[PDB]
Symmetry: C5
């Protein structure tokens, strides 16, 4: 329209986009800053990068862009693109993007009274410290620090407004707890003027159903399978294979967890502690299996069972476990031959008796170590899992 | 031509690309918006990003860009590149590309009566929620939401036209069910003016032949092969190897499947339910194999067969399964010697009979558990597969 | 020089880059379009993207860029950068790139009579249908479609010229079969005017030496290795281990091949069919081995061989391949004792005879299944490999 | 305000950004250059790239940009964007990104006296040689070289100021040892005019807790487990399986480590040396157990143990290792038969005596090789670990 | 300063950056071109892309950019940014970057007499054919082709200058043999004017220490370990397991090398030939093991040893190997019973003698095949390794 054309012609005249829109140059310009969070795009623990979708909200007052609505009775607001009016140079300090500024430059809407609104959208990547001490049950706080780059406290006075989460789209992995904000002015070695900034803290809680069903459960099942080796009779040689194959499966689980986790040395993580506990458990199980096999294939002639070992294993542990221990001259020539044969049979009988004793001792040791290892693994797993804070809260909210 | 040059020089006189081309400023401006879908390039499940090829379609009317055809013979249309004339700032809301705008800026075609068309092409990356509850038999709905950014309800009037699928190029993996659209109007915390938008909901179906053949059939086959452990005789010690090796193959299969799936806690997917059930089935088979081996290698004098176990196994299940149960002083000195030898032989025969009885009991248990495990695995697999909706539709459309 | 400066100053006065350079405004402008292929950079089958290196040859005539060489003796041609003169806007329709147009803008060379040449180079990424029905003996046709985005048939007259492959650099994996092209006119739902376009079809053939030597040969070797299970005597205990390890190796081979194929559902790839056939063959071999092991560790008194089974195996099949068959009162008391001993020995002899006959039956089954499985493997492999078209051509051209 | 607008209009009059702002045109312009490190984003050893967060600091004096505060009350500083005033083209020489310049251009702040400050932020990717000789106990020095690209010391004088680490954010992987800088001058064969440049040498240490816990401890554990072959009795046939499976685990660990290391031939990494040592140890263990199995299964009638071997093993080693060493007409034919039976039993007896001798020899060999391997592995591991410089301080810092 | 400002104002008067700065238009313009290589950043064999860091060097003479130093006492040289003066359009013909130009546009330094220098830095990605026939003992030549795009030989005269490698930084993996260059002019389908270009051929050698230590030696070691299957006694049934597991390790090695290696079909790589040979050797070892086990478990009454087999094995090969071959009515009734027992014992004796003969034959075959396979693997490995050219030079440079 003619009124719109005349207004655009008049406003642009004698306008310098390099000048701060203030009637009085000695007074700070008040700028209100906020943001609206739309989506938590990604959390990268290995690279420690948070990717989010955010609309920034900037509001201020321009002294020159004012007109009387009566003279232009059809237009109430105007729009100006980048590079033709003054705009705050607000940037995100802790950016992790190859381009430091990742905001799409849109139009700026102006009142008839000179009120400027700026709503740039963006996919922001920031670098926030990620704590993996209590993973999977960790809670993360990520910082987003915004501030002007070349405007101190005597020129541009930054003000904070509460973040808007009405349009937030729930994520399938993280639960949004809150997004508080705080405004603070700091000092820099460059300059002698304080510089304000606004920091928004995003608090997120990781949902644990996927991890607790894909990592925790198979670990306990496979550890139980390793415990099962204490039930196989020693007469079938399939114990070492069981133990070693279980160890291999644990190693592949460890490589998966290692490829999904950051290489930080800040603290030992809970999953690593669990894997180490299972490592020692299965290794000691294999060692005990070797000891049992050594006892089982004991040569009867090789030696005699120590008195202490006998008095322990065959009586105390047997009673405790309620296991019962199993148990003319030609005529003279024929006579001595059959005597020799009978004596040979007697010797074989004594040898088999000693062998049976050794086998019983091996069985007793096997049963004792089965019970002990079951108790140990149950206690260790329960303690390690429950040591995490808010573990019960996570379990309730996810599974229940 | 001279007429074209004269018209181009005349049209841009006193023009201003910053103003809305309306004869009356109070009245709004009508803009018709639509799109043409060319190809669905990629659907990402881990990152939940949809990549598509789309030609936008914007049409409107410009008041100033009008001329008489008679005064300028030959010329009927003109083309204006970016920055010469006014354009709507139509943006995709739920974008996911590093640059918030993915459209490629082309010319704008204008008729002799002031009618502007704008059809820019683009590779659009959007963020839509992906449901993996019924994977791989799932149907996905991905929403693309376009709208003006800085133009309100009384300035720009958005009208929806039907989408174009005439130029669609079919995708091997995905089947395009449809693409309806809806024009809505929303309020925002920024402002007191309604803002319209147009949302197109691409509804797509996943073709299941590839995933079926390369995921489910080998799983079924090797799960059935794991049942061969009940056909091997216990005399050959090659049962634990069977069980633990098929378990390892299953574990690597689960790892491969997990490496393609999102880490969401919304629900437990069908493929995960299948794999978990088969894991427990194989583990129970291994435990039963251990028990059977324990029965097979029972010590002849290590105990007595319980009456309950005998009456349960030897005569009940064997009858049910139709199993046949298998089966002169020198002279006096030689006399007592041969008596000793014969007595030892008789004792050995009795021990052999007891061992044979125990072995038959083990075989009976093995056969019983074979039948039970086969029934259970077939029932579980059929139930889990049939529980999904439109599974019969997917089968009839893909395999047949 | 002075003439160059004068001509450059004169050629720009009253020149509009927005104006189509034709003497008569109602006549179309003839533009000649052609390709120049330099290298085939990549063929991504998983993402179905073709990356190539091409130069675009565009030629046309400009009315206003004409001069007489007798006035500027030194200069014969001129050069104009982007944005200074009118240029055609030919774009590639099927572009699978973030930016829809990947061409490096270079200078436009102009005659002394107004002939403009434009030769922009570029690495082009396009989306074309890649079919893996005949992998790895497939021939691929990929289309590149070029056309003016906003100029109709009445305005811009597109003409086709034969593509140039003189500077083509041969690729180590794909063999260039050809690259013809064709013009076409199409209508669009936008408008009521035909839009010409030029489509160039690149036809390429894959060289199969690497894929054959790295996939086909090792799988056949492992199949032959798995066929050895029927040569191992049943007295050893490694049959199942051999079979299952072969199965594991081919499972990882299947994973390696599967990570490179697109997830398409159009057909079943040849390599997928061949892998499935090998899987079934090895599984049946394992089942047969289990049957034989059950058939060899048979209890002597646990049953009797059926007459049908005996007349099938012991005589018929054995003769088929010429297998030989493996074949005072004290005196009275000691008398009965030695009779008992001898009778025990006789019963043992009868039992071992029955066991030996059972073992011979097992050996016969092993031999028969060896022959059958070898025949099946040979027939299936030969048929599957020979089913592919141009397989003889590929072998003759890649194994010479 | 009016004063700000008037000053902005006045300053840019007759201003040329191409001109270097010096009052004499024959004396160099002094530029103070400094750096402010914020965070070490990444250290990619495979590609040898260091990614950091940097705040450049450039200060100089502009002769033309001066005014009087009294004539422009309230205005004390001004801001100038790109292309408005002169800037020094200071670049990083060893950049390793697509576009050579990775800085983000911001405003330039000018005081009333003409002092200009410039603090552009950036995420800088640089190429520094990374030493992996003592990985993981390594210390890395990476150099950042900054200098003007076109101006020289006769026109631009560079000066060095100490780097700022006030805002440094600790990394969970690297410890910042320091960042010393140095200003250097380079001369040319043409002219006696110095050319200055600045170099910052970021030296940092790697925290070894994660790498040690995830690599060394599991490998030592499994290497010690590989020694269990010498405790298994030869009757249980699992020694070879145990050893070869530990070899498989070794290969898995070797590939996992190799995927992270660069393919450098400068030296042999410490981790590679240690893995090779463990390879050799386990391989020799396999050879030894093969020898032991060969001795244990010796044919009693297939040979005689030589006197040298007898005195070496049976006597000397057993004494050293305290291994106890185990251990009417009819009557004529009746005599013949019983004598034959007795002699057959005696022959069997001497045979099993020889077999027992061989088995004892195998046991002694096994025990002595167990002791030798046990001491050797400990010595080799301790030596390799201790050979690394600063190992003691590294472990103290990372664990205590 | 005033003189610098005046000179800058005067030089750009009437200057047209679209014209060649030549006094005579007929004569060509001489441009000197060279480059300085700083670092070889990457050599991607799979994609066949060379990424390097270079500085271009262009020198020419400008006719209009001349002035008298006496009039401007302080000014000696000037600087002009992009778009202000004429520059050559030199491009890299075989670029592989997504943007065809990778140079960073810097300032152009201008003499006091018109000489112009231009040194833009760049990270260049180029596509060069990489031959891996002799991998890893390979020497690679990669060509960088530079030339003007729109200027022919009659206008722009390209001249070569020797490249500078003074600032080259050695690479850990690649040894720089050298970079010579050649200038040549060609004809194109454009037009009938020759176009010159400069091609620099970078020749480099790969350092083989890393690959030899990490890929070759482990293959040799485990291949030698696979030969231990010929020393294991047949009683310990763990030969097939050993062979199949070394097979599995070999397959994973082949998987890794397939991962690193490009999929070309020009020739069979040396490492591929080596791995194929090792596959064949271990497979034949497994076949021989199967034959040996078949001979070992021979039914004594199932057949008779052939006279041939006897004369080749039992004595001929034993001589060849110095192998020693191992080693009243009651009275009548009692008599016949005991003689029956004795005859039974005689039968067992002759059966065990036959079995011992078969076992000795198996041992002889085992030793023969051990020696043959050792010779085969040694000669094959030595020949394959030594077949490569410059293998001795590579070994002497990378190990001594
Ligand atoms: C404008 O800013 C600059 C900042 O460098 C001032 O220069 C410095 O002022 C302080 C206080 O006197 C001292 O460090 C030195 O006098 C100056 N440093 C250098 C390197 O010159 C300058 O004084 C300010 N001018 C006005 C009018 O405020
Ligand atoms: C040698 N140049 C580069 C390739 C073609 C040729 C050329 C000729 C004219 C205009 N553009 C390019």
């Amino acid at each position: 329209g003619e009124f719109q054309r005349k207004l655009y012609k008049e406003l642009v005249k004698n306008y310098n986009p390099l000048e701060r829109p203030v009637a009085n140059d000695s007074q700070p310009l008040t700028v209100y800053f906020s943001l609206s969070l739309l989506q938590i795009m990604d959390v990268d623990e290995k690279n420690q990068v948070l990717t989010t979708n955010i609309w920034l909200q900037m509001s201020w007052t321009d002294h020159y862009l004012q007109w009387n609505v009566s003279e232009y009775p059809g237009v109430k607001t105007v729009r100006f693109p980048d590079g033709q009016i003054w705009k705050p140079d607000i940037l995100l300090y802790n950016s992790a993007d190859e381009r430091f500024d990742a905001t799409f430059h849109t139009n700026v809407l102006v009142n008839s009274s000179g009120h400027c609104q700026y709503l740039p959208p963006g996919i922001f990547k920031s670098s926030c410290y990620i704590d993996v001490r209590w993973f999977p049950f960790d809670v993360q706080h990520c910082k987003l620090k915004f501030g002007s780059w070349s405007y101190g406290g005597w020129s541009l006075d930054l003000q904070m407004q509460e973040a808007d989460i009405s349009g937030y789209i729930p994520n399938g992995e993280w639960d949004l707890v809150g997004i508080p904000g705080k405004r603070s002015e700091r000092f820099y070695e460059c300059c002698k003027e304080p510089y304000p900034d606004v920091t928004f803290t995003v608090t997120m809680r990781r949902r644990t159903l996927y991890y607790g069903l894909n990592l925790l459960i198979p670990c306990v099942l496979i550890s139980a399978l390793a415990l099962l080796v204490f039930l196989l009779p020693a007469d079938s040689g399939e114990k070492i294979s069981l133990g070693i194959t279980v160890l291999l499966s644990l190693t592949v689980f460890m490589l998966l967890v290692a490829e999904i986790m950051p290489a930080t040395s800040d603290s030992v993580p809970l999953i690593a502690q669990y894997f180490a506990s299972t490592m020692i458990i299965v290794g000691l199980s294999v060692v005990v299996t070797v000891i049992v096999l050594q006892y089982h294939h004991h040569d009867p002639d090789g030696g005699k069972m120590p008195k202490w070992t006998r008095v322990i294993l065959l009586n105390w542990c047997a009673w405790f476990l309620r296991m019962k221990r199993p148990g003319d001259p030609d005529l003279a020539k024929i006579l001595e031959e059959v005597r020799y044969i009978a004596n040979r049979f007697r010797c074989q009988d004594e040898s088999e008796a000693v062998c049976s004793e050794w086998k019983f001792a091996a069985c007793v040791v096997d049963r004792l170590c089965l019970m002990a290892f079951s108790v140990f693994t149950i206690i260790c797993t329960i303690g390690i899992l429950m040591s995490a804070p808010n573990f019960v809260e996570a379990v309730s909210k996810d599974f229940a």
